[PDB]
Amino acid sequence: GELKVFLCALSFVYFAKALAEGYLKSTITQIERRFDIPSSLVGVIDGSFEIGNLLVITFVSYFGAKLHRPKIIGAGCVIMGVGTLLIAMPQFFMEQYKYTSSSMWIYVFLGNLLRGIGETPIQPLGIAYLDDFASEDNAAFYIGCVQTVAIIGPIFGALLGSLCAKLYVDIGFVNLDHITITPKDPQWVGAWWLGYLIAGIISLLAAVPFWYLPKSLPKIMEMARDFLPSLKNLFGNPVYFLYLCTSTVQFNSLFGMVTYKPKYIEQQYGQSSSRANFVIGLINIPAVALGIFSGGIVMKKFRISVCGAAKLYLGSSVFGYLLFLSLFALGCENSDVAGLTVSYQGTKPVSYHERALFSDCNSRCKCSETKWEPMCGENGITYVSACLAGCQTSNRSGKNIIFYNCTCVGISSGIVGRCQKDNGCPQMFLYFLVISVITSYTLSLGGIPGYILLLRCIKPQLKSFALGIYTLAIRVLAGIPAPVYFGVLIDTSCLKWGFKRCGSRGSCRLYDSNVFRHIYLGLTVILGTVSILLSIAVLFILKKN
């Protein structure tokens, strides 16, 4: 009974942590779309959690294995909740919002730092406690349930972020009857702070059950001395080392795939950002959670050994990246954009040295080069801005704006937005959706077999330390670097760069579909192939030993 209570408490803690991270990400994403924060500052906010987690993950993982693990998890939850509550602090000190970096971001930085610090004991100590006292058949199932809760959590965080953004910022502080603005108003400001308070309260509540859980189920100097031999023992173990390398390469592939999958959908298939986020959050993430749970259930039900676990991991990786290779055939060509993909004469592929945002048809109009306000003409050719199309008059009809007397279009009306991709791209998008869902499920099928691989070949006293080292390696070598170079190589395929209000380079507005697809899919597939080779090596060594 105590083991089930611990499992429920750990699942609730995972849910709270995932909800907090999801709310942070979703809130920052919307804030980036309405407000203007320089990318360096949001990068600092992201990196504070990182340094806080990395500085203490190894210390906690090594020195908390022999201590009261449930109580250390409870303390970590309390620290996480306190840090999350500290993020919403500035709202209580800033003046009432009336309708950019000084002495007020310290609260956010400290809150993210403490939230990263409190995060460290949850996974290594919790999973080690779960594995030590559960039977070998049920340990995989319990780990699968915990990871399934972890994957699903951020969906609720995003939902809470949306609900909070639908509320006014000064709710509770200012009489709302005097507010005449609606969420559709460009000056509307959401109650960003409310979700942080809710997440902090949930994290604090999650620490209560661990004060009543026992240390085990049916001094510092010595640990410091044994630390160095233990690290060599873990890295002297070839199964653990090679699985660590395999997971590092595979997560280098996976983080890069996940980070730029929204943008790939929007750019390759012409979908809006909302649709791209929807198909990922409510379709791909459930598939990932189902794959993890299915892997755990398969491990439990058929009593799969370590060799079978390695075989399942290898098969899941192989059949996931094989299906990911199928996405190469599901590609639409670049949309007709005048001056970047085609000339103003409607001539197909134009080269680099001919990027002619100014033409004869729009010489009479003094247009801005930096502004990206795309309009779709009656001739099916998208123009960078209405000025560049030679449009002289604009008429607002209903929710739409129609431009007339567009000189470039006549070589003459146009609507707001990009022209839709006509020749079978929605069908290609549907096939992409199906294959991507199946690929996500297949890749997630091996998440728990690899986790069991990590645990069943080390000496039982070093499970927490091995989990800590694994988490540190995944964060440092896969979590941090993979987005950076994926983005850089992807940015090499940009055709038109937007700018922020301060003149700094913003997100790219137009990519080259072919080059973008090639880079994005090829990097993922190559890293996956390297991971498959390493998994084959792991399986060979397991068979040898």
Ligand X SMILES: C[C@]12CC[C@H]3c4ccc(OS(=O)(=O)O)cc4CC[C@@H]3[C@@H]1CCC2=O
Q: Using the rule CB under 6 A, is 479 a contact of ligand X?
A: no
Contact assessment for residue 48 and residue 109, using Cβ atoms and an 8 Å cutoff: yes
Residue keyed to tokens 């998890």: 73
* Exposed / middle / buried, residue 454 (Cβ in 10 Å: 0-12, 13-18, 19+): buried
Four-residue CA torsion sign, 435, 24, 267, 251? negative
Stretch of 27-35, 120-128, 206-214, 415-423 lying at the interface with ligand X (CB under 6 A)? 27-35
Rounded CA-CA distance 195/524 in Å is 34
Min. distance of Cβ 298 from ligand X in angstroms? 15
Residue keyed to tokens 């030679």: 390
Q: Using the rule CB under 6 A, is 374 a contact of ligand X?
A: no
Closer by beta carbon to ligand X, 284 or else 341: 284
Percent helix, strand and coil across the chain, each to the nearest 5: 65, 5, 30
Contact assessment for residue 117 and residue 465, using Cβ atoms and an 8 Å cutoff: no
Min. distance of Cβ 482 from ligand X in angstroms? 12
Q: Which of 284, 341, 524, 535 binds ligand X (CB under 6 A)?
A: 284
Task: Report the 10 Å Cβ neighbour count for 8.
Answer: 12
Closer by beta carbon to ligand X, 206 or else 443: 443
Q: Using the rule CB under 6 A, is 174 a contact of ligand X?
A: no
Q: Using the rule CB under 6 A, is 108 a contact of ligand X?
A: yes
Q: Using the rule CB under 6 A, is 224 a contact of ligand X?
A: no
Q: Which residues contact 480 (CB under 8 A, 6 or more apart)?
A: 50
Token pair of 154, please?
């951020």
Helix (H/G/I), strand (E/B), else coil: 518: helix
Stretch of 283-291, 337-345, 348-356, 486-494 lying at the interface with ligand X (CB under 6 A)? 283-291
Stretch of 97-105, 298-306, 352-360, 382-390 lying at the interface with ligand X (CB under 6 A)? 97-105
Q: Using the rule CB under 6 A, is 443 a contact of ligand X?
A: yes
Nearest to 19 by CA among 203, 206, 163, 153: 153
Stretch of 24-32, 126-134, 203-211, 383-391 lying at the interface with ligand X (CB under 6 A)? 24-32
Q: Using the rule CB under 6 A, is 280 a contact of ligand X?
A: yes
Q: Using the rule CB under 6 A, is 531 a contact of ligand X?
A: no
Rounded CA-CA distance 70/294 in Å is 28
Q: Which of 31, 44, 197, 476 binds ligand X (CB under 6 A)?
A: 31
Helix (H/G/I), strand (E/B), else coil: 40: helix
Calculate ∠ Cα 485-148-528, nearest 5°. 35
Binding to ligand X, residues 445-474 (CB under 6 A): 447
Q: Using the rule CB under 6 A, is 89 a contact of ligand X?
A: no
Min. distance of Cβ 50 from ligand X in angstroms? 16
- How many residues form the binding site for ligand X (CB under 6 A)? 32
Q: Using the rule CB under 6 A, is 94 a contact of ligand X?
A: yes
Please provide residue 413's backbone torsions phi and psi, each rounded to the nearest 5 degrees: -110, 165
Residue type at 76 in one-letter notation: G
Token pair of 172, please?
């509770």
Closer by beta carbon to ligand X, 362 or else 524: 524
Helix (H/G/I), strand (E/B), else coil: 424: coil
Q: Which of 3, 25, 29, 30 binds ligand X (CB under 6 A)?
A: 30
Q: Given phi > 0 = left and psi -120 to 50 = alpha, else beta, which region is 450? A: alpha
Min. distance of Cβ 289 from ligand X in angstroms? 8
Contact flags string 118-147 toward ligand X, x per CB under 6 A: ------------------------------
Q: Which of 254, 314, 408, 538 binds ligand X (CB under 6 A)?
A: 254
Q: Which of 38, 90, 308, 506 binds ligand X (CB under 6 A)?
A: 90
Min. distance of Cβ 268 from ligand X in angstroms? 13
Q: Using the rule CB under 6 A, is 159 a contact of ligand X?
A: no
Closer by beta carbon to ligand X, 501 or else 544: 501
Closer by beta carbon to ligand X, 381 or else 527: 527
Residue type at 304 in one-letter notation: I
Binding to ligand X, residues 177-196 (CB under 6 A): 188-190, 192
Q: Which residues contact 116 (CB under 8 A, 6 or more apart)?
A: 48, 49, 50, 51, 52, 53, 83
Token pair of 355, please?
């990027």
Min. distance of Cβ 32 from ligand X in angstroms? 9
By DSSP bridging, strand 400-404 and strand 393-397 are: antiparallel
Q: Which of 120, 148, 248, 440 binds ligand X (CB under 6 A)?
A: 440
Binding site for ligand X (CB under 6 A): 27-28, 30-31, 34-35, 87, 90, 94, 97, 100-101, 104, 108, 165, 169, 188-190, 192, 254, 258, 261, 280, 284-285, 288, 292, 440, 443-444, 447
